[PDB]
Design a protein around this nucleic acid. Structure first.
Ligand SMILES: [Mg+2]
Ligand SMILES: [Mg+2]
Ligand SMILES: [Mg+2]
Ligand SMILES: [Mg+2]
Ligand SMILES: [Mg+2]
Ligand SMILES: [Mg+2]
Ligand SMILES: [Mg+2]
Ligand SMILES: [Mg+2]
Ligand SMILES: [Mg+2]
Lengths: 63, 104, 52, 88, 117
RNA sequence: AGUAUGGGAGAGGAUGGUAGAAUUCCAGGUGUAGCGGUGAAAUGCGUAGAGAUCUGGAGGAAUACCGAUGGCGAAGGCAGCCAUCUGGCCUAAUACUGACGCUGAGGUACGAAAGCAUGGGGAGCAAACAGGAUUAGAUACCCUGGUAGUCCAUGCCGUAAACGAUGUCUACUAGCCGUUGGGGCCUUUGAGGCUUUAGUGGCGCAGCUAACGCGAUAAGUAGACCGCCUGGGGAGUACGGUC
């Protein structure tokens, strides 16, 4: 991130730009993942569901 | 024999010795038999992150052809030489003799 | 793609240092694996940062 | 591992005719060389189960080829087993 | 007593509590505050407002050292990370930079079990 | 069906080394009242100084991002990077052997997790267990701790919803759209368009089916061999036998 400030940038706008930087980075997502241990079977099922949904979305876009 | 690419990182304090060490390695390789296809000195470069509280080191590149016994000797020398901080050895197919990038 | 070609290697690394996926960069499957291996080798050689 | 020169030598030693690379004698000799070479590897890696399957496959292929040679002509079979040093 | 122009504010936000500390460069501490420290004991600790009051009190305490520009480091999820920086800016400080320093393992230790609630 | 020679992709297996991030613990610098946790609390930790922050060390385990309806493997299963040993697969054209093939009762080898034996190691997690809560009761669900175990070496044990709930091999039977590793042909604006092949996905005609659905990766049309079923319980249980 390292959101350096301009000479006259408002602090609120700076915090808004920092929020965009962090949201693009996706740091909070990994922290959310790390809270609990997920079993390999559950991870497999989740990834399978995600892939199926992505394929259906792409087909819908193509149609 | 086989072709190996070697990259060496040398402590800056021992920079003046680099010419001697590479010469000794080449002498050993040639005495065994050896075929030194490439030798490059990238120069003293800054490290993207510190290693043993060192912020910069000397970078050396070599492309050689030698046998298993030699490879073992060079590996042992690199491990037990305190001037060297990190070495990468890669098996390669065919020999690279062209001028490489980062050689400026 | 070789580990010594940092100018090109950097075009597929984010500011945080993470490797950009193939989806966003449009590269091919075979190219992506070589590029990831080269980035890992460059990280080991302390030529590019692991993180930050 | 064996080299191209070694395989060429075995084929030269066991070839019935020119360009003969498909004869049972040549095939069995090549398999025997490969097996006796792999014995050394399996001496140092006892728990490499995945390679032992290929080794067993080589053994089975040699057995089938030897049986075919025995069924077709006994004299060639006896000569081959004698040359290669195999009990049966 | 000692006067330092430059300082850093660490915001250790969590789902249960927010801790705001002010240190100098090289990490020596000057002042600190917490939601539990300033009333709000209970579930209201995690609310952003308590983060704002903690940041205000921490900044007022740190002003004695005469620092007017401070860097910002933020670590952890949960509310209060934004309110703390907003309060620090409002108090009169100048925020030079804001960065996230939340630690990410590269698949190290096993996390605790999931709660069946 | 098999063999020799040129190329290609791959978390296929075994052994050793090495890098970064993070957690725990231990010492040191600043510093003062809380930290932690829950629906809410409480146990627990803290003025012999916690938490937070910075500096230096010990040790164990696993490899973020790339990552994919992706890849490899007979199955079980395989994830950072490097070296050594090693199995299989795909692909081009030549040159060979000449049915050398498919299946397979007994038998034999492999075989997740848990558990067992001897000797090591032990960060985090965690059966048992201890305390704090909720409750009419709480032997549990929630919270604070925590032993075996999870890890390494050498063996044993032979089990799973070990699942596609679909044995192996062979030939044939409308099409349409993806993706992975290769072969061939044509365009030019340096990457695209057609075919072909071996995998891996989504639809769908005919056909099949109690229906749901399957549909060139068949549960369609045919052939070879094997395993298994005959109402629900009693019961994968008793006796005998082998391990
Ligand atoms: Mg081992
Ligand atoms: Mg908890
Ligand atoms: Mg069979
Ligand atoms: Mg049987
Ligand atoms: Mg517990
Ligand atoms: Mg066993
Ligand atoms: Mg069974
Ligand atoms: Mg079954
Ligand atoms: Mg029984």
């Amino acid at each position: 991130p390292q959101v350096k400030l301009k000479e006259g940038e408002p602090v609120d706008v700076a915090i808004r730009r920092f929020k965009r930087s962090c949201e693009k980075a996706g740091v909070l997502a990994d922290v959310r993942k790390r809270e609990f241990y997920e079993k390999p079977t559950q991870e497999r099922k989740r990834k399978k569901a995600a892939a199926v949904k992505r394929y259906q979305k792409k087909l819908a876009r193509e149609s | 024999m086989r072709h190996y690419e070697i990259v060496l990182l040398v402590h800056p304090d021992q920079s003046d010795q680099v010419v001697g060490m590479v010469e000794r390695y080449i002498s050993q390789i040639k005495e065994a038999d050896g075929q030194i296809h490439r030798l490059e000195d990238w120069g003293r470069r800054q490290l993207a992150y510190p290693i043993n509280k060192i912020h910069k080191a000397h970078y050396i590149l070599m492309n050689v052809e030698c046998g298993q016994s030699t490879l073992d000797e060079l590996e042992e020398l690199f491990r037990y030489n305190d001037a060297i901080i990190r070495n990468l050895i890669i098996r390669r197919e065919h020999a690279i003799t062209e001028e490489s990038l980062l050689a400026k | 793609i070789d580990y010594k070609d940092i100018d090109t290697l950097k075009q597929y690394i984010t500011e945080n240092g993470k490797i950009v996926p193939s989806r966003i960069t449009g590269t091919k499957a075979r190219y992506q694996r070589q590029l990831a291996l080269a980035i890992k080798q460059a990280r080991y050689l302390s030529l590019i940062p692991y993180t930050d | 591992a064996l080299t191209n020169a070694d395989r060429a030598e075995i084929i030269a030693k066991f070839a019935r005719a020119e360009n003969d690379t498909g004869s049972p004698e040549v095939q069995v000799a090549l398999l025997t060389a490969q097996i006796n070479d792999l014995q050394g590897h399996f001496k140092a890696h006892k728990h490499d189960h995945h390679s032992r399957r290929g080794l067993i496959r080589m053994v089975n292929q040699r057995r089938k080829l030897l049986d075919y040679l025995n069924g077709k002509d006994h004299e060639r079979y006896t000569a081959l087993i004698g040359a290669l040093g195999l009990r049966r | 007593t000692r006067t330092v122009s430059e300082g850093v504010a660490h915001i250790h936000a969590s789902f249960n509590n927010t801790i705001v500390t002010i240190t100098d460069r090289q990490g020596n501490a000057l002042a600190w505050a917490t939601s539990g420290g300033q009333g709000f004991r209970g579930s209201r600790k995690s609310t952003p407002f308590a983060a704002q009051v903690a940041a205000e009190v921490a900044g007022k305490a740190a002003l004695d050292y005469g620092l007017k520009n401070l860097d910002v480091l933020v670590k952890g999820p949960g509310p209060g990370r934004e309110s703390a920086v907003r309060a620090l800016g409002a108090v009169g400080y100048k925020i030079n930079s804001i960065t996230d320093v939340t630690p990410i393992p590269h698949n190290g230790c096993r996390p605790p079990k999931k709660r069946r609630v």
